[PDB]
From a paper:
TRPV4 is a polymodal, calcium-permeable cation channel that has emerged as a potential therapeutic target in multiple conditions. TRPV4, expressed in the plasma membrane of a wide range of cell types, is a polymodal ion channel whose gating is controlled by multiple endogenous lipids, and exogenous stimuli including synthetic ligands, cell swelling, shear stress, moderate heat, and ultraviolet light. Human TRPV4 adopts a two-layered homotetrameric architecture where RhoA attaches to the bottom layer. RhoA appears to act as an auxiliary subunit, interacting with the ARD through three loops connecting AR2-AR3, AR3-AR4, AR4-AR5, and with the membrane bilayer through the prenylated C-terminal tail.
Three additional complex structures were determined in the presence of distinct ligands: the antagonist GSK2798745-bound TRPV4-RhoA complex in the closed state, the agonist GSK1016790A-bound TRPV4-RhoA in the open state, and the agonist 4α-phorbol 12,13-didecanoate-bound TRPV4-RhoA in the putative open state (ligands are abbreviated as GSK279, GSK101, and 4α–PDD, respectively). We observe that going from the GSK279-bound closed state to the GSK101-bound open state, the S2-S3 linker (M534-S548) undergoes a loop-to-helix transition, thereby altering the interaction network among the VSLD, TRP domain, and CD. In contrast, the rearrangement of the S2-S3 linker in the open state couples the VSLD to the TRP domain and the CD. First, the D531-Q550-D546-R594 interactions within the VSLD are broken. As a result, Q550 (S3) interacts with both the hydroxyl group of GSK101 and N528 (S2), while R594 (S4b) forms a new salt-bridge interaction with D743 (TRP domain), and D531 (S2) interacts with R746 (TRP domain) (right), resulting in the ~3 Å swing of the TRP domain and rearrangement of the CD (HTHCD). We resolved GDP within the RhoA-TRPV4 signaling complex in the GSK279-bound closed state, and by including GTPγS before freezing grids we observed density consistent with GTPγS in the open state. We did not, however, observe substantial structural differences of RhoA between the GDP- and GTPγS-bound forms in complex with the closed and open states of TRPV4, respectively. Despite only subtle conformational changes in RhoA, the buried surface area between RhoA and TRPV4 in the open state is reduced (~684 Å2) compared to that observed in the closed state structure (~752 Å2), suggesting RhoA-TRPV4 interactions become weaker in the open state. Notably, the EM density for RhoA progressively decreases from the closed to the open states. Because we include GSK101 before freezing, this data suggests that either bound RhoA becomes more flexible, or its occupancy decreases during GSK101-dependent TRPV4 activation.
Author numbering:
A (entry chain A): 292 to 639, 662 to 788
B (entry chain D): 582 to 639, 662 to 726
C (entry chain D): 292 to 436
Write the structure that this text describes.
Amino acid sequence: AACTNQPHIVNYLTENPHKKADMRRQDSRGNTVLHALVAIADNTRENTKFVTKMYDLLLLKCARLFPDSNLEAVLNNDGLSPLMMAAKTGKIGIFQHIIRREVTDEDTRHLSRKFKDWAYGPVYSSLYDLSSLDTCGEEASVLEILVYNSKIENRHEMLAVEPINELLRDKWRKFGAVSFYINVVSYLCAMVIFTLTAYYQPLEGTPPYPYRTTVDYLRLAGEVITLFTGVLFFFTNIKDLFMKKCPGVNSLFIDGSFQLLYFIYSVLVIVSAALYLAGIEAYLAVMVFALVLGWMNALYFTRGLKLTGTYSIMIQKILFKDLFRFLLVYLLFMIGYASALVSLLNPCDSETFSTFLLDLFKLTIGMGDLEMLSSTKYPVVFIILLVTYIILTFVLLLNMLIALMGETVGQVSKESKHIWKLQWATTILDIERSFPVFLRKAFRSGEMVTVGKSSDGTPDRRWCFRVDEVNWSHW
Amino acid sequence: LVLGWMNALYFTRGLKLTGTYSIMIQKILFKDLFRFLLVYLLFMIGYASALVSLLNPCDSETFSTFLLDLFKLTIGMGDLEMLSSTKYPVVFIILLVTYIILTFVLLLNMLIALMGETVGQVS
Amino acid sequence: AACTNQPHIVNYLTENPHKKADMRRQDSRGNTVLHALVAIADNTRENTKFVTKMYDLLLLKCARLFPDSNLEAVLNNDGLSPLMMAAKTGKIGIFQHIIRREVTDEDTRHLSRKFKDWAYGPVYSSLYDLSSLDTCGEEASVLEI
Ligand SMILES: CC(C)C[C@H](NC(=O)c1cc2ccccc2s1)C(=O)N1CCN(C(=O)[C@H](CO)NS(=O)(=O)c2ccc(Cl)cc2Cl)CC1
Ligand SMILES: CC(C)CCC[C@@H](C)[C@H]1CC[C@H]2[C@@H]3CC=C4C[C@@H](OC(=O)CCC(=O)O)CC[C@]4(C)[C@H]3CC[C@]12C
Ligand SMILES: CC(C)CCC[C@@H](C)[C@H]1CC[C@H]2[C@@H]3CC=C4C[C@@H](OC(=O)CCC(=O)O)CC[C@]4(C)[C@H]3CC[C@]12C
């Protein structure tokens, strides 16, 4: 009845002399009336009005009939609440209303979420409530669900709400900037140490090597530090994976690529160690690749910077999606032409094929010499085919990929401000979540204002957060 | 002398036909190119250090000569002869290919995207 | 009172049998009533109208009460005037109005900044004033700022 916009039916059914349908009743899924109302909620102009009206009416009735228990407290089997479910489903229309819910009624004004602090002239300061909007690990928070979760219809719009922006700003100012630069400095120092260790690697001798000289004191420390740092990265990345209740593939592979890369960096660095103990000969081959990957995956720290925040996100986006889609066609061309040219030539075979492929790649770059035609028969058709290869690839494809690449960068330019805000929020939340619980509680934000008293008179004493704005038409 | 010749665009600022050019080249140079060059330098440092470490001579002069050769390659000229002396040549070529692909194909002309967007704002 | 859009309060306070608040009064910063009015001025449609109305009313009252001294002449500690401060702060709404201020009143039309030169058919020639808008090094100019 509630989902079908029939207030009279709901009113009659709630209070009937024969039977009553308690509003705090859960189905098999665990969803109660508010859960279902949010589920059918839509962002359309007409639907939102009636959804909000029915939600407020039902919540007020439930509070009036049962003053001890709050209806929104009930959770479904998934553990989410109507606010959290609305945030996860991307239904801004009901979410924004729930965030700024204010009740004028004196009897049941306690359940309001937005209070008025004071007005001085055009300046108005209002005190929002964030008891469940921000949690220091005690329970799931709306902010983490809104940010980390993927495939949300209106994530960017829901992030731009009155309390969210101010809370992110305050959290960033309080400790985010202090620890972000410490992070950058420590990581860069570790990378420099790793590079110096890699350079001063004794090729002569069978690994492991004896350490007797003065330089050995310094050289061994670099390897030990790098190995311990890799192990620490692996432990951090397993702890984080379990912290988010084991996010699936969609969380790791599609987005947040850096969360996966450090895992790879975590593997190779330790893998080499094993070889360094037994597989002495070929530990450099993988150690150098680990070093290259570590150097290349430092854009996670650049994500935060406003000036260069977009660059990392858009290079990661374009690389896997545009370049690979183009590379499919490019590889079709490469395979066809290379096979044709290899077949055509007459030597009078694996080594010859490899050498020809090397020569053709060197040509593909734009350097080298065209000497292969001398030995082969039918040189004219060979040159014609080479010309078609060069024309097609270089002239058309090489710089026609640039068309959609520039279009992608154009989309990113059109949405640069919005994406930077998301990335900055992600990095600051990331940094926060690694802190210990007790320290996080010590860094709690907000006040303990006793705005109102309960029905029995006891003080609510709930955590809140105050903001202010300016209006000139309120005369 | 070079700086004096290069800093004559102040007088070209006035001309209506070429007034924008100087302002927008000064704007793009310090803001877009440097922001891109941060990432490019990350790539350069990582790959150059890796390649220098990998090679087996059997050191400052050798490192400088290798860096010169690698820069000459980076332009698009020179020859790929270093692989002969080093061990594990196949991984060396793979790493060089990744270097060339990433930088030249993606970054070299993806900077052009936001550069053209900047020139679009100026237009 | 002026910044809060209360013309009646300003009128009463300016002329009261008990005490009077002179409009050419400077605070610690040096900003006078016009300076403060410009400071809170905004480019919004509603704010600009009342800001300009109050500015004109207060300037006319000050000129009427004291004909010898012009209120806009007073400078703050920074040395700027309401026109210069508006130019520096980027508040176009009050700036454009100040530039083309024209007073129809005969008694106090001297303080106007835009005059009419002559009209020939559709052509209209008007004579603006730039006494402080352009300065040859004598004092800071709006254009340079
Ligand atoms: C200790 C706090 C004051 C700050 C904390 N930094 C660290 O703990 C360390 C930094 C460094 C640098 C050099 C050597 C050793 C360490 S230990 C910090 O702020 N963060 C770490 C947790 N974070 C992560 O684990 C992301 C998000 O889950 N995953 S990741 O991409 O794989 C990653 C990113 C950077 C670092 Cl570094 C380690 C990792 Cl797995 C986020 C960000
Ligand atoms: C355009 C791109 C994105 C697609 C091509 C992928 C590259 C990574 C391929 C193109 C040509 C390949 C090369 C062709 C021939 C050789 C020689 C081969 O070893 C030899 O020198 C052969 C001599 C012998 O074994 O006797 C090792 C790999 C290499 C460099 C291949 C490694 C990978 C390369 C550079
Ligand atoms: C892509 C760009 C924007 C970043 C790279 C900066 C360039 C200015 C660097 C790249 C390689 C560098 C060169 C690498 C090696 C050398 C040799 C060095 O002197 C030598 O010839 C070594 C011989 C010896 O000392 O015995 C002088 C600098 C030079 C040309 C370096 C000067 C600066 C270069 C050109």
